[PDB]
Design a protein around this ligand. Structure first.
Ligand SMILES: CCCC(=O)SCCNC(=O)CCNC(=O)[C@H](O)C(C)(C)COP(=O)(O)OP(=O)(O)OC[C@H]1O[C@@H](n2cnc3c(N)ncnc32)[C@H](O)[C@@H]1OP(=O)(O)O
Ligand SMILES: CCCC(=O)SCCNC(=O)CCNC(=O)[C@H](O)C(C)(C)COP(=O)(O)OP(=O)(O)OC[C@H]1O[C@@H](n2cnc3c(N)ncnc32)[C@H](O)[C@@H]1OP(=O)(O)O
Lengths: 360, 360
């Protein structure tokens, strides 16, 4: 199996959102990932490409046989991933204490939203709920409108799965010293708060307000925002540093002498009006050509459907084709032990067959 | 130093955005992190709390001595982080090969936006630019308006720092088996694409469209969006599963038989108007109480300045007081080798002191 995590053995108690995304990435990087779903499920081969780089098995964990077969897998594995409410694995007999008794090298990885304790620990939730409580959702969107969810990118994945991964991998480094596994408690409400640590830092030094749409990085700055072009499509501008901003102005055809200062916030309305009129005078693909190879920090805002035609995306092989649809290649990249293309979702496998393969 | 990464040694060449965030998380989890800045930028004790859990040393890397001293650090370290454009470390004589001569065990970690090669590889950029090229930015915001940046959470942090971290820690694992370091190439355009793999999967199965504001998780669904309340503050609704959705309607006082089906998308505008009126008739705190302990997936949308008063936040100690204000505690959490509270940014120390501390 190709990639730096070759040899790593992972058991995933099937769930939704972050836990499968973490499991996918370990698979992506060469880990041997075995996914236990319930049998009331899997109608053949999955169409869900997030379940790539997996072996799927089924098992009623409520039954005695199911539980015993699960515990045999966990006994021979490096990592367990579960993302059910706190208490579910305990009551099923697969809690950390029970797993510790059959394999004290195990990394026991618990993926939740609210965490393992506290008043909300049993409420159902999704990404939008977890980022609503820690101040993040309130900060996203235009000032004159209600907050808008940044898909499920910030809570599920960026503040969820990715912190789960860092915990798993940090714990595996620690196990090199101690010879011992441990519990990783990854909560989306905590992870996402660390993801936005910058804003908490800037807020302490008066460089970030709670007012939505009135900061440097939320769309409030005329030089960090999107602009509509002549054709109704968009470019993005990210010209924070004065030398990049000057390059953008020159490319737009505006003399610095006619505009207000870049960071005179009281004249941002005027500046936005000027940039708006200038970007609106040609189409997105015009601006893309003008600004290619420049430090102006102006790029076209591509729709998913157009991404496959962008030279820089093509050349670095950011995507691969699979089942009438492009998919992202593994990230990040490794000089010596490169990842390979992902394997598609396979037909279910028998759980004894895995135990035998794992040397049993 | 508490945490699973006790005894990991990390040299950070000072940059902006993702590299410092990764370095911070390594520190947070107990790595020994030494940050090399240039003498011209360091003034008093640094007031950017993203520079917590570091030792700061200055060193003109363009000088012969600065270079020599830095190669002596790298010699004694496990990981090097650099976030400059490609070519930059090479010309300093700190490139991956100069480093492999003094330490073939080093994990050489390169944090860029566009990658190591390809047509955009020397282009300046920020978060908003990296996410504009791969479909992500186009998908964020309301449909009748231009895309809005989700702060810098998706490119720098979620698809940036976090993948550098997964790469550093996966390579340390590969290394335990091979004796050898390697180069980790973390490109924000790649990481952020993997971060949004769920949407690529969903597009292939016809379950996601390129139309902004017309999807389950982008704000188009009336049951996954924010609503304004009687006091002008907001709640978030994330009631995807029908049972949770049903529980939400009952608490709004709405008879499910009077409403269009949850997932009849042609009638979503109509459903939204009914839910809008319901949520508008009481204030945020009313709804927060009404739905406490519920599975209705309705949560108050708090501003940063209110987060310190939320019981679930207080009781799990997601934050600690510092400096000007609250900052997020390390994530994720570990049962045996637990992180400790972050050490503030300390004063600059001399690079010889450090080399004493690390031996040769
Ligand atoms: C769709 C995008 C996702 C997002 O945006 S992230 C949102 C999801 N949130 C999380 O994942 C955080 C933690 N998880 C949760 O809060 C809950 O799992 C979630 C998602 C609310 C779903 O709630 P429920 O459906 O109530 O599930 P739960 O966690 O309370 O318990 C799971 C039930 O499944 C059972 N189970 C799981 N694997 C099984 C197996 N192989 N065989 C037999 N039974 C199995 C388990 O026994 C439990 O059922 P029960 O309570 O015992 O009736
Ligand atoms: C504010 C929010 C941030 C976001 O939203 S993320 C966006 C940032 N993008 C990235 O970090 C991607 C990779 N980095 C870059 O593209 C560039 O570094 C970036 C951010 C465009 C800035 O470009 P430049 O300022 O041109 O910097 P550069 O990386 O090209 O090279 C800088 C020069 O600094 C020099 N330098 C660094 N540390 C030094 C030291 N200790 N002593 C002496 N010289 C030192 C280094 O030699 C380099 O080269 P040179 O002077 O052109 O040869």
């Amino acid at each position: 199996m190709a990639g730096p995590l070759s040899g790593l053995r992972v058991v995933e108690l099937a769930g939704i959102g972050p836990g499968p995304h973490a499991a996918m990435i370990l698979g992506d990087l060469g880990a041997d990932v075995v996914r236990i779903d319930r049998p009331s499920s899997v109608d053949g081969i999955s169409r869900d490409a997030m379940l790539r780089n997996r072996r799927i098995v089924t098992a009623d964990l409520k039954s005695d046989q199911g539980l015993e077969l699960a515990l045999k897998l966990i006994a021979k594995a490096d990592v367990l991933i579960e993302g059910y409410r706190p208490g579910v694995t305990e009551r099923l007999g697969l809690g950390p204490e029970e797993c510790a008794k059959v394999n004290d090298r195990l990394i026991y990885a618990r993926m939740t939203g609210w965490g393992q304790t506290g008043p909300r620990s049993q409420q159902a939730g999704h990404d939008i709920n977890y980022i609503s409580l820690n101040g993040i959702l309130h900060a996203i969107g235009r000032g004159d409108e209600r907050p808008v969810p940044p898909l499920n990118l910030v809570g599920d994945f960026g503040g969820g799965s990715m912190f789960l991964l860092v915990g798993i991998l940090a714990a595996l480094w620690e196990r090199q010293s101690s010879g011992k596994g441990q519990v990783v408690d990854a909560a989306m409400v905590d992870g996402s708060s660390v993801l936005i640590q910058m804003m908490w830092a800037m807020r302490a030094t008066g460089m970030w307000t709670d007012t939505r749409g009135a900061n440097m990085l939320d769309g409030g700055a005329p030089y960090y925002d999107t602009y509509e072009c002549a054709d109704g499509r968009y470019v993005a501008v990210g010209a924070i540093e004065p030398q990049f901003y000057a390059a953008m102005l020159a490319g737009l055809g505006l003399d610095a002498a006619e505009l207000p200062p870049q960071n005179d916030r009281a004249r941002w309305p005027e500046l936005r009006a000027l940039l708006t009129e200038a970007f609106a005078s040609h189409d997105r693909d015009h601006w893309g050509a003008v600004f290619a190879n420049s430090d102006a920090c102006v790029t076209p805002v591509l729709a998913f459907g157009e991404v496959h035609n962008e030279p820089h995306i093509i050349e670095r092989n950011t995507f691969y084709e699979a089942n009438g649809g492009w998919q992202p290649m593994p990230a990040p990249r490794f000089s010596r032990t490169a990842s390979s293309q992902p394997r598609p979702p396979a037909a279910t496998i028998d759980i004894e067959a895995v135990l035998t393969d794992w040397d049993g």
